[PDB]
Design a protein around this ligand. Sequence first.
Ligand SMILES: O=C1N2c3ccccc3C[C@H]2CC1(F)F
Ligand SMILES: *[C@@H]1O[C@H](CO)[C@@H](O)[C@H](O)[C@H]1NC(C)=O
Length: 353
Amino acid sequence: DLRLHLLLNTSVTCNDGSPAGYYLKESRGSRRWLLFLEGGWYCFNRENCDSRYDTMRRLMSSRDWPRTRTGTGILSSQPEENPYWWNANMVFIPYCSSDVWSGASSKSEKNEYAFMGALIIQEVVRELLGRGLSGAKVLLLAGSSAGGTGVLLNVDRVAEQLEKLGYPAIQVRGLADSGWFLDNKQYRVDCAPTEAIRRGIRYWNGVVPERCRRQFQEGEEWNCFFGYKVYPTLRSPVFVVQWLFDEAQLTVDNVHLTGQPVQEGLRLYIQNLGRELRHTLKDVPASFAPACLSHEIIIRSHWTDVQVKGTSLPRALHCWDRSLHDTPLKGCPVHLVDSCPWPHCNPSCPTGT
Ligand SMILES: O=C1N2c3ccccc3C[C@H]2CC1(F)F
Ligand SMILES: *[C@@H]1O[C@H](CO)[C@@H](O)[C@H](O)[C@H]1NC(C)=O
């Protein structure tokens, strides 16, 4: 179990002004730290944030958070469930800022909600330094869905934080799961990701990585929420996990797979989507992209089951670790992208059971 700690700096808040926090399981005698960013969509104006506050309040408030959570998948401390990093110090950072972890805005008499995702990450890191993070050799900032996009937006800022706090020896790395989206045309008010993100950044006072901001410049920072555009600007090593037919991608593309027969137009659309993902990952050396219709991987208890070209994700991550030791490795690959063109053409895809 991971134990809740609310942030001692109570200026760093969830949407409703309640303090943000993190869940921690320490592992003494490990110098590895895993900081996982929860996902869960976002909201981008008063009305849809109000709706979220009614029926998704744990994603906007710590008022009702339990005092413990069970680590699962890459957050599990059992080798049987987590072959990769079972002995690491484990941190789960709840997503309660609804801003894809980009916000730097307080609740005030101008702002009904606080959007502090970028500041929550920095404050968690700061308070962990006194809990043992000061002794770390590797800090892996991981995340799923909106949390995976959050990794891309924040991994280099965590690296700069630690460098400026005087810890240049801590190697910061990113693991972005299911956060690599395409600003493609839809198959056919509440949205095209580009337009919703555009509005969100203004509403959240969202921040993006500096090099990416300098490329796209004022008014165009929404571009930096799309992995294939922000990744090449990053300096920290980032491992990208993305289903080729991601369910959230299909949802924002207005594809609703019904079990009904798939007509030619939709078949071509889905095949072209998988081809475009594959293309965006061609020059991503550390990646795991199975040809499945699914969403999120790394905190699922059966995350060990999926394989690409016979290599599981825990193995690929272990190979990544080896590759960052101070030339490719025989039989221990890090770039694993399916080439087959239809969901579940890979037999190891999740069953949905
Ligand atoms: O994280 C998520 N999304 C996101 C983030 C940045 C850019 C585009 C998107 C799509 C949306 C789906 C989500 F809610 F799963
Ligand atoms: C609390 O966090 C805010 C936002 O990052 C920061 O400006 C402030 O200095 C912090 N307070 C303390 C006591 O560290």
